[PDB]
Ligand binder design. Structure first.
Ligand SMILES: CO[C@H]([C@H](C)/C=C/N(C)CO)[C@@H](C)C(=O)CC[C@H](C)[C@H](C[C@@H]1OC(=O)C[C@@H](OC(N)O)C[C@H](C)C[C@H](O)[C@H](C)[C@@H](OC)c2coc(n2)-c2coc(n2)-c2coc(n2)/C=C/C[C@H](OC)[C@H]1C)OC
Ligand SMILES: CO[C@H]([C@H](C)/C=C/N(C)CO)[C@@H](C)C(=O)CC[C@H](C)[C@H](C[C@@H]1OC(=O)C[C@@H](OC(N)O)C[C@H](C)C[C@H](O)[C@H](C)[C@@H](OC)c2coc(n2)-c2coc(n2)-c2coc(n2)/C=C/C[C@H](OC)[C@H]1C)OC
Ligand SMILES: Nc1ncnc2c1ncn2[C@@H]1O[C@H](COP(=O)(O)OP(=O)(O)OP(=O)(O)O)[C@@H](O)[C@H]1O
Ligand SMILES: Nc1ncnc2c1ncn2[C@@H]1O[C@H](COP(=O)(O)OP(=O)(O)OP(=O)(O)O)[C@@H](O)[C@H]1O
Ligand SMILES: [Ca+2]
Ligand SMILES: [Ca+2]
Lengths: 360, 360
C-alpha cells in the first residue's frame, strides 16, 4: 500500500527513488551552494550559480561530514526530485562501510526529528550491491567518486574486520587526468574544465590487461591513440593517458600514495576472512560503482587475483552492466521484500529508545 | 679500495670493464653457441664454430629473453674477459628503457644467487649516456644494433611516460644493405657475407642532409660513388645505397614499417613532456649508440627538429665522438662517484627483502 523511498548518498552523486523501481528516478550532484553575500542551492543549480556561491560537498570519502548541508540535500531530494512528503514513506538510507556509530545515529535523528519519517533503515552500500547481483555471500569492490572499499559478505552480512579501504576514487582519477593534460600544454583548471576532463575519462580511458606491454605499444605506435573534440572545436589526442589514468587504481603511487592497489586490497580482504569461506569469496567478486566502469577492469582483476591466489582456486569477477546504480538497486529490492517489512525502525521505536536503536 | 664492474648488455655487443676507466676493456658479440650434437661457447669463438653450433642472441631489441644463455654471457664476461671473481666486486648492470619489472628482478636474482655479487645496481642505458655527456637534464636518442629509443631525462631521471621506441636499428640497416646489394647481382647471405656488408655500412654509408637532393645528385652524376674491395679482390661500387640505407632511420617505410622516423619520435617525446621543460630538452639532444655514428646524422636531426619545433626554439644536437660507448662510460662514471656508494643494493638487503628491492 505505502511505497518506501531509497536514497543512496554518495560523495559525488545522490541516487534516489522508490523501492521496487529498477533505477533511481533522481541522480544529481552532492553539492550545496550558499550565497557568498534563497539561503541555499543544491546540485546542478548550485553549480550553475558557482560564480556567486560557495560550493560544498557534505559527504567526504563516503562519510557525511556537514550535517546542515546534508539536511538540504535530503530536503531537495524529497520535495523537489521526488515530490513526496517524507512523513508518508518509510525511508531506506545508505552508508559507507566503517561509518562511525555516532554518524548513523545522527542520520537517524535527522530523518525522524526533522523530516518526521514513519520508519527508516540504514544499510551498507556494498552489501546492497551484492544483493543486486542476486547473492548474499561474496566480496564486493565498491569504487565511486570519493572512496574505494573491499567488503566481504557472508550469509547477508558484512564482515567488518576484513573490510579494506583505499582513499582514492573517481575524483582523484579525474584530478590526475587534469594534471597530466595540463602539463602537456592544455589548461584544465576551472570546474567547467573539470567537467570536460571527467567526460574524457569516462569516454576514452580503459584498464590495460598488461600495463607494461601497453606502455610499450603506446611508445612504438599510435594504434592506441584517440581524439576528443573540446567545446571550442579544438582537438586533443591522448595515447597512454587513456590507461595510465585508471592504472592508478592498481598503482596508487602514481598520485603519491603508499597504499595498496585494488587488486591487493581485494586479496588482503579475502585473506583476513575465515579460511573456510575464501573459496566462495574468490568465486564471487562483485564490482560496484562508477569507477569500476572502465573497459578492461574485470579481466585485469581476474589476472591479478589469479597471480596472488593459490593455483587451484576458481576466481570469478562479476561486473554487471548497471553497476553505476547497483547500490541503489540493491536497496530498492531489499526495501520491497516482504521479509524486510519487520526490519524497519519505526517512529514509535525511536520515541521509545534512542537513536541507538538503529544499530541493526 | 674495491673496484666496481660495469657491464652494458646490448643486443649486438656486450661492453664490460671497471668503474673509473675511460673505455670498456671488453667488447664482444652477444652470442651463445651450443653444440648441435664444452656445452656452450660465447662471442667470437661461437661465431668461429658456427658450422657445428646453434647460435643464439639472448638479448632481443635490448630486452633479455633467454636467461640460460645470458648467464653464460655474464660468466664469460667475468671469468674470461675481465678475469675477476664476481663475488668481490659491486656490479652495475644496464637495461633498456621500458624493461619490465619482472625482467629486472630476474637479473637481480641471477647476480646475487648465481654469481654471488656483494652488491649491484641496474641503470637505464640512455640515462647513462646523458651522464657521460656531463648532463642530468636532456633527451637522448639511443640507437644500437637491435632497438632505438628516445628517452627524455629531467634532473637525473628518465620520464617513462614520454619514452618513444622504434623497433629498428643497426641489424635492420645491415639486412637492408644486404638485400639491396643482392638484388644488384651480388650475393650477400651467409654470416661471413653479413660481416662484409656491416663493414660496408660502417665505412661508406652516411645520412643525407636533404634526401631528395641527394637522390637527384646520384641520378645525374657519379660524384657520390665509392668503391669497396671484397676479400676475394672483387670490387663493388655503391652510390645512392650509401645514404638510402641509413635514411631508413628517418623513413621506416623503406623496410615496410609504418612507424615514425627518429626525428618524429624525438619531437613526439619532447611533446609528451611537461611544456615547462621542453626548452631544455630541445637544447640538449644527445645521441648515443653505434647506429648514430653515420656522418651527417646530427645536421640532419638539427634540420628536421627545427622544421617541427616552434621557430624561436634553440635546438642543439650533441653527438660525442665516443658515443659507441657512451652508455658504458656513463656507468663507469656513476659507479665511481662517492655520492653513488650508498645507492648499491647489497647482498644483505637482497637477503632481507626480495628481488623487488631493485626498483631504484
Ligand atoms: C531480509 O534481509 C536480510 C537481512 C535481514 C538484511 C541484512 N542486511 C540489510 C544487512 O546487512 C538479507 C540477508 C537478505 O535476505 C537479502 C536478500 C536480497 C535483497 C536478495 C533477495 C532476492 O533478490 C535478488 O536475488 C535480486 C536479483 O533478482 C533475481 N531474481 O535474481 C537481481 C538480479 C540478479 C538482477 C536484477 O533483476 C536487475 C539489476 C534488474 O532486472 C531488470 C532489476 C532492476 O531493478 C530490479 N531488478 C528490482 C527492483 O526491485 C526488484 N528487482 C525486486 C523486488 O523484489 C524482487 N525483485 C524479487 C524477487 C525475489 C528475489 O529472489 C530471487 C529475492 C529473494 O537476495 C540476493
Ligand atoms: C648519484 O646519482 C644520481 C642518482 C642517485 C641516480 C639516478 N639514476 C641512476 C638514475 O636513473 C644522479 C642524478 C647523478 O647525480 C648523476 C651524476 C652523473 C653521473 C654526472 C656526474 C658528473 O660527471 C660528469 O659530469 C661526466 C663528465 O665529466 C665532466 N667533468 O664534465 C664527462 C665529460 C663530459 C666527458 C668525459 O670526460 C669523456 C667521455 C672522457 O674523458 C676523457 C671520459 C672517459 O671516461 C671518463 N671520462 C670517466 C670515467 O670515470 C670518470 N670519467 C669519472 C669518475 O668520476 C669523475 N669522472 C668525475 C668528475 C665529477 C663530475 O663533475 C663534473 C660528476 C659530478 O653528472 C653529469
Ligand atoms: N564510464 C565511466 N568510466 C569511468 N568512471 C566513471 C564512468 N561513469 C562514471 N564514472 C565515475 O564514477 C563516479 C561516480 O560513481 P558513484 O556514483 O558510484 O560514486 P559516489 O557513490 O558518488 O561516490 P562514493 O561511492 O565514493 O561515495 C564519478 O567519479 C564518475 O566520474
Ligand atoms: N661507424 C658506424 N656507422 C654505422 N653504424 C655503426 C658504426 N659503428 C657501429 N655501428 C653499428 O652499431 C651497432 C652496435 O651499436 P651498439 O653497441 O650501441 O648496439 P647494442 O647496444 O649492441 O644494441 P642495442 O642498444 O640495440 O641493444 C651495430 O649494428 C653496428 O653495425
Ligand atoms: Ca557510492
Ligand atoms: Ca645498447
Amino acid at each position: 500500500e505505502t511505497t518506501a523511498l531509497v536514497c543512496d548518498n554518495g560523495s559525488g552523486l545522490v541516487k534516489a527513488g522508490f523501492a521496487g523501481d529498477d533505477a533511481p528516478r533522481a541522480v544529481f550532484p552532492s553539492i550545496v551552494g550558499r550565497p557568498r553575500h534563497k539561503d541555499s542551492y543544491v546540485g546542478d543549480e548550485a553549480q550553475s550559480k558557482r560564480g556567486i556561491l560557495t560550493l560544498k560537498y557534505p559527504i567526504e570519502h563516503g562519510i557525511i561530514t556537514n550535517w546542515d548541508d546534508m539536511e538540504k540535500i535530503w530536503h531537495h531530494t524529497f520535495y523537489n526530485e521526488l515530490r513526496v512528503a517524507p512523513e508518508e514513506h518509510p525511508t531506506l538510507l545508505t552508508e559507507a562501510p566503517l561509518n562511525p556509530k555516532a554518524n548513523r545515529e545522527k542520520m537517524t535523528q535527522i530523518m525522524f526529528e526533522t523530516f518526521n519519517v514513519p520508519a527508516m533503515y540504514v544499510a551498507i552500500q556494498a552489501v546492497l550491491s551484492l544483493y543486486a547481483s542476486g547473492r548474499t555471500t561474496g566480496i564486493v569492490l565498491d569504487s565511486g567518486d570519493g572512496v574505494t572499499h573491499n567488503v566481504p559478505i557472508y550469509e547477508g552480512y558484512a564482515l567488518p574486520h576484513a573490510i579494506m579501504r583505499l582513499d582514492l576514487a573517481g575524483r582523484d582519477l579525474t584530478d590526475y587526468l587534469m594534471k597530466i593534460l595540463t602539463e602537456r600544454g592544455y589548461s584544465f583548471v576551472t570546474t567547467a574544465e573539470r567537467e570536460i576532463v571527467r567526460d574524457i575519462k569516462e569516454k576514452l580511458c580503459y584498464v590495460a590487461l598488461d600495463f607494461e606491454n601497453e606502455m610499450a605499444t603506446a611508445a612504438s605506435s599510435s594504434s592506441l591513440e584517440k581524439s576528443y573534440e573540446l567545446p571550442d572545436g579544438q582537438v586533443i589526442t591522448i595515447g597512454n593517458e587513456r590507461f595510465r589514468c585508471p592504472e592508478t587504481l592498481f598503482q596508487p603511487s602514481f598520485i603519491g600514495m603508499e597504499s595498496a592497489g585494488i587488486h591487493e586490497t581485494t586479496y588482503n580482504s579475502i585473506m583476513k576472512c575465515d579460511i573456510d569461506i575464501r573459496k566462495d569469496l574468490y568465486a564471487n567478486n562483485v564490482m560496484s560503482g562508477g569507477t569500476t566502469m572502465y573497459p578492461g577492469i574485470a579481466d585485469r582483476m581476474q589476472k591479478e587475483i589469479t597471480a596472488l591466489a593459490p593455483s587451484t582456486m576458481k576466481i570469478k569477477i562479476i561486473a554487471p552492466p548497471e553497476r553505476k546504480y547497483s547500490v541503489w538497486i540493491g536497496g530498492s529490492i531489499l526495501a520491497s521484500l516482504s521479509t524486510f517489512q519487520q526490519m524497519w525502525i519505526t517512529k514509535q521505536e525511536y520515541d521509545e529508545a534512542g537513536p541507538s536503536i538503529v544499530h541493526r
